[PDB]
């Protein structure tokens, strides 16, 4: 369940995770975080690379899990390019909304993952011929995660903006895709 886009993104999160253990989280935030200073305005990778940072074993394992399953689903059934666009768009909008709500010091693939949850779900309700559906197990687990975010019942501050923006994007995209 892992084509080249799914695979490179995981390797990338792994390579980044390793880089955060050697150099420490802070120094990698300085290079990959959303622009936290006017000077950084034009370091363009930053509008996407926040999606690559994970701050703990739990963070990266859960994000990579969802990603591998839904993202790898989107890849094999709908094509690599589609997963690419979903990822670029969600990563961008989730980053924007997150930073508008809580500053630039955030990271994680979960904005992307929430777009995948919303896309694989709504695409299957409106266009079940697509072959694309969020199995009810995952509908439930996706609901729970979401609720976990909004009411903040883990140990760390949740990127609530990145989540909402993420889900919005994936809906809009599956909506536009199910038109016919």
């Amino acid at each position: 369940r892992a084509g080249p886009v799914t695979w490179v993104m995981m390797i990338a999160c792994v390579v980044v995770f390793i880089a955060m253990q050697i150099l420490g989280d802070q120094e990698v935030m300085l290079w990959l975080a959303w622009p936290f200073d006017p000077t950084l305005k034009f370091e363009f990778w930053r509008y996407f690379t926040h999606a690559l940072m994970h701050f703990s074993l739990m963070h990266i394992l859960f994000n990579l899990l969802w990603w591998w399953y839904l993202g790898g689903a989107v890849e094999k059934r709908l094509g690599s390019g589609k997963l690419i666009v979903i990822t670029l768009i969600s990563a961008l909008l989730s980053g924007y909304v997150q930073q508008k709500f809580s500053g630039p010091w955030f990271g994680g693939l979960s904005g992307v993952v929430y777009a995948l949850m919303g896309y694989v779900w709504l695409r299957g309700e409106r266009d079940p011929q697509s072959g694309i559906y969020l199995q009810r197990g995952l509908i439930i687990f996706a609901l729970i995660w979401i609720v976990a975010g909004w009411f903040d019942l883990f140990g760390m501050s949740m990127a609530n903006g990145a989540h909402i923006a993420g889900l919005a994007v994936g809906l809009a995209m599956a909506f536009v895709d199910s038109l016919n």
Partner: peptide
Amino acid sequence: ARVWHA
């Protein structure tokens, strides 16, 4: 540090 987890 505190950072927000996405």
